[PDB]
Amino acid sequence: HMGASRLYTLVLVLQPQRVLLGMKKRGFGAGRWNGFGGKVQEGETIEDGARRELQEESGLTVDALHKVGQIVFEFVGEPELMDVHVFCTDSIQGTPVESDEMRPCWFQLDQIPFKDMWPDDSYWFPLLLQKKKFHGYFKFQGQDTILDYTLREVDTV
Numbered sequence: 001h002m003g004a005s006r007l008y009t010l011v012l013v014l015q016p017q018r019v020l021l022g023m024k025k026r027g028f029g030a031g032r033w034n035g036f037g038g039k040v041q042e043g044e045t046i047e048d049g050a051r052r053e054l055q056e057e058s059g060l061t062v063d064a065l066h067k068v069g070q071i072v073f074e075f076v077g078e079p080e081l082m083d084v085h086v087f088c089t090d091s092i093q094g095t096p097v098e099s100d101e102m103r104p105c106w107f108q109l110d111q112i113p114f115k116d117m118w119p120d121d122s123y124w125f126p127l128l129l130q131k132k133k134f135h136g137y138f139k140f141q142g143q144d145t146i147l148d149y150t151l152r153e154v155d156t157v
């Protein structure tokens with residue numbers, strides 16, 4: 001996929017029987033549940049950015065973050081591609097709290113609110129729950145419509 005892309009992180013706190021998601025309270029995608037994360041800044045590593053966003057958005061720090069996927073997004077009419085680095089953790093160091101950006105809630109793994117999530121999540125979340133690593137690409141028209149996609153499992157994220 002040609003063109004400049006912008007680095008983002010997405011963090012799923014996935015415990016044996018539940019996953020933490022946040023309701024995005026402002027900005028692009030407000031009104032959907034998603035993992036924690038955001039744009040990576042100058043002067044931090046991608047994993048540093050993931051930790052920063054998780055702390056800002058939920059108050060949580062973690063022992064370890066594990067690379068589980070990469071997703072490229074194209075939004076029709078937007079010049080910049082999104083290059084999203086997906087991480088998983090089961091080593092949180094506190095209780096999540098609401099932020100300006102995100103309202104956190106735990107969901108049982110059979111009650112993941114896919115209808116109130118980005119539509120791509122329905123495709124890759126199952127791979128995450130199955131502990132498979134993946135590469136995805138999703139081309140969106142607006143926020144609701146996936147026009148094209150690819151998804152595969154990988155050995156190296």
Ligand SMILES: c1ccc([C@H]2COCCN2c2ccnc3n[nH]cc23)cc1
Nearest residue numbers: 008009010028029034036037038118120
């Ligand atoms: C980290 C990275 C991205 C996002 C959100 C909101 O920012 C715009 C792009 N986002 C998404 C687009 C497409 N599919 C998504 N799944 N989960 C999140 C998605 C939240 C947190």
